[PDB]
Each structure stands twice: as C-alpha cells, then as structure tokens.
C-alpha cells in the first residue's frame, strides 16, 4: 500500500503505541489504515453419489481441478456467496446445505468456508473461469490434479467420512 485512500497522501509504516506490529498510517489526514483477511466461500455440489468439480482456466494451476469457490462480496450472506460462486464458475444451481469445513490460511490471510450443497439440475457448463465442469464419482476424482490443498484435504475427508454417516463439521489450518 503506497497511498491513502481517503486523501491521496503517501502512507508510512508505523507501530502504534501499545501494539507490536506496523500499520500503514497516513500523516496528511492522521488516520490508520487496517488490512484484514479475506473470506473465500464455496461448496461441494452433490448429485446422487457424485460431486461437481471445475478445471481452472486462470492461473495459478490452470488445468488443475477445484470446487466452485471464490472471494465473498459485500452485501451478501455466506450462503448467498457460495451459491453465487457456483453459478458463476459452473452455471450450476445449488441449494446450500450445512457448513462442512472452515480453514485458516494465515500465511496468505485467507479463510475458506466450504458448504455441503445439493445440485438442482444437470444443465450446467463452464463459466469464463472454467475450462470444464463435470461430475465425478469418488473413484473418478483426480486427487493428484487438485489445484489447492485447502480444496483437496476437506474433499477427501468428506468423501471418505460419508461412507460412515453425515460428515462432521471441522475446522482446519494450512500453514505455509
């Protein structure tokens, strides 16, 4: 961050009194500019015993597979965000069900929230961020070609736990 969004002055890194870490502050308007982590919302679209994955079109990891997911926007709920991201990436209509996974990615100041979801029809197809979209049985999922560990781990757990009953919600951490 180079400039102040409120007045256009150049910002500088200072540790406020009582704190131990720097914040960008603006000496022209005398205000502190806080940075906060970002939420990524998405879901596991289920159809019969299959799940919908998307092959990414945009780096990083083009050609690798993932779940519909992306940055939450302002003026929406978590559920609204997950359904919107699914429609945008996969042209797919889902009903969002239980929150399944919450992951902290502290190194990149991200939080992933992954919901269970019911695919409502098969009339789906790639949006611009996707090369392709399709349903996979558990034995079809290309585990080695999943883009992100934050997607790979909860998905594998989900598929495996649901042989035994309704997968239990869990909280994860992926470090650098």
List residues near Zn ion by CB under 5 A. Answer: 4, 6-7, 9, 26, 28-29
CB of 163 to Cl ion, least distance (A): 21
- Least gap, CB of 118 to Cl ion (angstroms): 13
The secondary structure of 29-46, three-state, reads CCEEECCCCEEEEEEEEE
The reply, when asked if residue 43 is annotated as ligand binding, is: no
CA atoms within 13 A on the CB side of 153: 13
Q: Among Zn ion, its own copies, Cl ion, none, what does residue 10 contact (CB within 5–8 Å per kind)?
A: its own copies
**Total residues belonging to the chain:** 176
DSSP code, position 77: -
Please report how close the Cβ of residue 77 comes to its own copies at its closest, in angstroms: 4
Helix (H) or strand (E) holding 102: strand 94-105
Judge whether 4 is annotated as a binding position: yes
Nearer to its own copies, 5 or 49 (CB): 5
The three-state secondary structure class of 144 is helix
In this complex, which beta carbon is closest to its own copies, that of residue 141 or of residue 167? 167
Do residues 51 and 141 make contact, with C-beta atoms less than 8 angstroms apart? yes
Known binding residues: 4, 7, 26, 29
Known binding residues for Zn(2+): 4, 7, 26, 29
């Amino acid at each position: 961050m180079k400039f102040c969004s409120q007045c256009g002055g150049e910002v500088i890194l200072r540790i406020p009194e009582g704190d131990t870490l720097p914040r960008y502050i603006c000496p022209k308007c005398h205000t502190i500019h806080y940075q906060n982590p970002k939420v990524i919302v998405g879901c596991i679209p289920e159809w019969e015993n299959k799940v919908l994955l998307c092959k990414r079109a945009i780096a990083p990891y083009r050609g690798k597979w993932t779940l519909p997911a992306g940055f939450m926007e302002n003026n929406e709920t978590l559920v609204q965000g997950a359904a919107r991201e699914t429609l945008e990436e996969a042209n797919a209509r889902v009903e969002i069900r239980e929150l399944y996974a919450v992951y902290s990615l502290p190194h990149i100041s991200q939080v992933y929230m992954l919901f269970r979801a019911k695919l409502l029809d098969l009339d789906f197809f790639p949006g611009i961020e996707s090369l392709e979209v399709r349903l996979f049985g558990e034995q079809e999922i290309p585990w080695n070609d999943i883009a992100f560990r934050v997607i790979h781990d909860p998905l594998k757990r989900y598929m495996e736990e649901r042989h035994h009953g309704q997968p239990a919600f869990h909280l994860g951490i992926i470090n650098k």
